[PDB]
Symmetry: D2
Subunit: 391 residues, 4 copies
Amino acid sequence: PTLKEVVIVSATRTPIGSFLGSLSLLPATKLGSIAIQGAIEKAGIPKEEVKEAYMGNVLQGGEGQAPTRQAVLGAGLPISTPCTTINKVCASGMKAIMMASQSLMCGHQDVMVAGGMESMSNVPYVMNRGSTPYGGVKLEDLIVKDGLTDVYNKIHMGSCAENTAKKLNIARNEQDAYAINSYTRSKAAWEAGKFGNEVIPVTVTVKGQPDVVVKEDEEYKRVDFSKVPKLKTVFQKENGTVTAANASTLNDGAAALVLMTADAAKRLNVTPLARIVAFADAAVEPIDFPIAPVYAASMVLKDVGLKKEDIAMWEVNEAFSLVVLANIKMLEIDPQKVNINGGAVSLGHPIGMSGARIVGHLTHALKQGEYGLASICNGGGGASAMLIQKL
Amino acid sequence: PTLKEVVIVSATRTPIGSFLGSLSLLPATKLGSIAIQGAIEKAGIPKEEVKEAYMGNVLQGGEGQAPTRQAVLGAGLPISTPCTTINKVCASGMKAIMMASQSLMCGHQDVMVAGGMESMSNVPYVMNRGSTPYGGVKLEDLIVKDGLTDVYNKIHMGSCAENTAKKLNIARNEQDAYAINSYTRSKAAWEAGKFGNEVIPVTVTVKGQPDVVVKEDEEYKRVDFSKVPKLKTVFQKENGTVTAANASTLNDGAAALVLMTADAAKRLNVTPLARIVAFADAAVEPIDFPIAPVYAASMVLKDVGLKKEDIAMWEVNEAFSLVVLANIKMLEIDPQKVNINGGAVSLGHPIGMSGARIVGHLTHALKQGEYGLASICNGGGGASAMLIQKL
Amino acid sequence: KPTLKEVVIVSATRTPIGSFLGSLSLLPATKLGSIAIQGAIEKAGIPKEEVKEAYMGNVLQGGEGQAPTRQAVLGAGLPISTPCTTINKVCASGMKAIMMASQSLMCGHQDVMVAGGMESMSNVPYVMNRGSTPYGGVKLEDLIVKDGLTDVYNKIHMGSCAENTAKKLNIARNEQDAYAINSYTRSKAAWEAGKFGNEVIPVTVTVKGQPDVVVKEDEEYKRVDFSKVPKLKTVFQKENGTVTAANASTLNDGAAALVLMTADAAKRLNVTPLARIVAFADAAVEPIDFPIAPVYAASMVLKDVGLKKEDIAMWEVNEAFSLVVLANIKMLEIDPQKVNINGGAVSLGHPIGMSGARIVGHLTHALKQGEYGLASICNGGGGASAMLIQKL
Amino acid sequence: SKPTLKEVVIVSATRTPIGSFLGSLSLLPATKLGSIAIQGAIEKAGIPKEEVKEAYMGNVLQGGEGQAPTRQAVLGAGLPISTPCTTINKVCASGMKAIMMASQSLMCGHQDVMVAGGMESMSNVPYVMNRGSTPYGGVKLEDLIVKDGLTDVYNKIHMGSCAENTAKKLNIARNEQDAYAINSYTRSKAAWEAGKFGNEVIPVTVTVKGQPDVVVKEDEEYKRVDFSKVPKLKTVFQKENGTVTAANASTLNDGAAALVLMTADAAKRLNVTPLARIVAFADAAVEPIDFPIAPVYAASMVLKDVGLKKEDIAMWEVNEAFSLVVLANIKMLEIDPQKVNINGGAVSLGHPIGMSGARIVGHLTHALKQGEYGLASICNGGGGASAMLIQKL
Ligand SMILES: [Cl-]
Ligand SMILES: [Cl-]
Ligand SMILES: [Cl-]
Ligand SMILES: [Cl-]
């Protein structure tokens, strides 16, 4: 038996909300249900056709049992749908799509949903099990402990990024310029209505209060260009370059894609949006995560036999402005082709979701026949990358 | 390309420690490193041959960033090794093996490590982010909140088991007899030396203390048969059937398998233990998880045209004695062929590890040519199953 | 019969009372204490160095740091040579502090003292027991509830104890709601008439990179809706209840301080005293019956001095609940127009450690020359303190 | 003119044994220890419980003890519901300050019989979490023993680190401190084996369901020492040139003490034999870091007030908060060391902080010979001290 061709038939997401902001009352799983239900509606298929689901989700503590199952059932999918929650840190939402593609390729399923979800607003604090130490204890923040601290270096991802800024000589000003570029591209894309088929509105209902309709990304509107160059370099007191403005923020959101075999799409009279061509994972020293996406992207190109020039648009996840700039520089790519409609620095970074968002964005933004390449670094020194072609 | 055949080359585990017991000082990821290093040693290959790693791990809160990456780097595997942490609740350890097999089948990697790890001793308590409510703050136990509570029904796994005991007419005395049988078989297998190849010893080292070598599963010795029928039914005080003795326990442990394509096994000239024949996931109504493994096992049998009678050895994970009895009753299989060397009720149940342990046990215990079938229920109403044939 | 030094009040100052998590909530109890103590010494027109010792009531001390009264005193800029003691008689603390200070003065053991009370209920923490966390989790308890508001013996809230007295004395919901509205009315009128001009000192709340807030009046009395009062549900007892969130006192932040001295010291220091402290007493009853303890304490003071209830121009009976005040009016058979005339805790709020000091200070300012004032305050556990003063 | 005051006498002084931290009495809350000592004292006094008019108890760490700690102790000892109660906090001086303030009420003729003492269960002191929004990056759970009991607010350092400052200034070395400490343990054991606390201390039965009853009848802390280890121990409060150690400092402990106090007139009316007369007392305060010297000034104040000389004092109880403190006091007052802390103190017996001030007064009451003067003094966090002079009757 030969490997089956895999197609993206729909790709949908919630808006991204700011930390403790517009979507902070919704658990990650509920955002997941919203995205999954939206993606299935858009695919125009009976929901019973979806055979199995994988969702990325990095910070699972306190979400209750089986987060992906919660998202799936909450979306109204059948109780017969098996569910697995995926954690490759920042790459989780992309790795979910990759693993689901592998199942489809094997003929183990013909239709799946894959994506990612995160509610950083609802990530809790932890207290160790045991006896309390004389003198007190600090209950640790799981965003910091599980999401953002490199285990081996015992420093923030932001501090790890400083290493790359040093080695590649990427200055504060260049990072700030990228960050401003991202906010500008985000606003322009929202104003041009570019997320109209991608984002679905979320109604937040509180008892006794009026409904709030969240219809666009919250983060990009919280910028002051005049203040960008004034911020302190918080991850390194001496010779620092990374700031709160030129790094991604803490956010809430979910994205989901409907994936099928080519045969399943034919059977169901569905016109797919894009073909999944290839994907790869790469890993380097934990401190050097910003550069892993370079290797992952090169693997994919070399596997398919494409040149970098053959890629119409790049989605290189904006964990930090530093990451994108390292990637542009090492790969020598046209910066007008990279994160064209904004990215994590200005739209925000719900870590388990972003890897799925960037792939769904390519699916909508590419023109017929064009190749898009999405890549995303992750805590621990990893990256995932994926090549798709618009149909 | 054509789908590649997958073989199990090695299968190794730590002993299983009791809650707050012999292994409680070691993090899940450390147990992971131990199992991973041991499986590579038993496989007789350079660590550098391992291309990618998947580990099941249900309760990831407070383990630090990227648990699987920590296990892999802590075992001395190359920094180039991509890692993904898998959460299908209790089925996590088996699902990791299944997904790794799918990547190998696709020709996306040729050698992987897959397994599961859990340190329930070290799972923390959580406090919600936000304002402290007037009148008190609740610190929830992640074991209870994420591990053991069904989301939809708002009851413990043990109460879901009671539901199945009612519907299938499985009485307290029947569950108690099964549990006693499990304890008996575990002790017999340990005394017969049946885990000599499967289990590797763990050395627990404490500053200014003598070393402690943990060489055997701890839990099976923790029973009093005379008290078994006198114990209170903790999940249902009136007309109950499930007890602390006839349920599985909370435990610490890790297991890891080295998987290869048939081509890689030949290239490297290793002696494969077993071929992976088929695997499947099924899901039912959440409260009914005890029966999900029946459907999952039936799926794998049907997939490859085998009948229940063709199976020499069944590993039906003993989440509760109730579960195994429900499976035997529905499948109508010979109890003498089920969990022959004990299982989770007497050996313990580190949830993210168990699905891998039972596959690994089949790999060592099956005789040449024999088929073994492993199935494992999971929170949310799911199950995974795998069929292997001993080489 | 002992011959004792005559004790006088030379000043009585307080911060405004802030609402729970409200205007004064960024300020620790000890800081509010410093503000009131400094204000009191300022109004007394004496050197800080003249204050020899300080006692401050403070019910909920957990997490405030070592020696709360010492913090308040040194925080006001008083000499490092000033001995300090923090007093806890629950809700009576602010009064008991004045009483115990008076006793020292009477003995000739000191000639000038500061006495009062402080509480920041906004900043009262939660606790977790020492030891090993039980499998399955734990509820960290709220100290306001555990130490402040729960009767140990009956294992119920103060408000539920009050329901007991409402039953026994036939003090219905409507009468209590009427008393409540009356307190809010009187509080507003007094504030609008400028009746706290010399008693209250404003506090400036400063937050880096924010405008300053000058808190110059009590925050709580403006937080009522008279239309909602009779519609509120009875929180401490659903079945046949009378006590509500509106007719009970609230959780609050504030501090009060008095300069006390011997009559001799006042003369030496050429300051004119406001009032003479005549007598005071403590009484106790069954813990559940705390609302009636102030009746017995007041009667003890009258009997001791040989006065009649009719001789008192002005009564301050702490408004812990509207019920408590009505229960006192009923049993004592006194004229309601002479009781809590410029409002009280039901509308002004109840920072538990300070209220007993506040009400003595208010009598001091409001009484006319030669008039007698009687202040009484119930406390958790079944107790009450009372004090008789005479204006000079 | 000086007021004419009632004479105040100590009629009984009774305490629980002192338990080590998380040791023998750690299952009992402070208030129950309070009840045990209060009932003890009244029984020993030989009066009806209804004769006690009012109660003051010292108690420094009141968090989580429930409403009105003193009221709990009092009602728990079976005293009438008519008995008013006040909980006193002058940190380490609380147990003595309670007796002092009760004495003032008696002097004024405001009461004729009172119970005064102190109680502390440091084993049961909880941790705290602040009310409000959980701050990004972590939430601290503070130990109230550290935060409220042992940390100087102003200097933001442990009491033992403040103690180092005086060791420095007065040149009191490690070995002298250690010498004192061993001296305390020695006196403690001697006194206990001689049966010297036969009337002072009452035994406590600890009942755990399923378990055999435990009878705690002697102080726990003094047996927990190794004299050979003493000189070896690390100086835990200061990195450079330290002198204070876990062994020459007092420990965290649990205990209560209560005294029955009355006017001379009430003792006659009740036909009881008074034990001692309360002569004078004082409080002093210095710079917060300098709390080890504050008892010097407090004692001097008392002697000066009564016109006595240091040489007139038969027996000194200078609370052994730290070995350093007793030494500083001996040095500055120039008194006979053989007259100081004769039967042990807080370094060997332990230091339940709200209790110790009452314990040491109770101890002079039992130890002094007819007509002798005893002086008890006690430092407290914040830079204070209380002192009391008594004469045996
Ligand atoms: Cl990785
Ligand atoms: Cl599932
Ligand atoms: Cl009382
Ligand atoms: Cl002081």
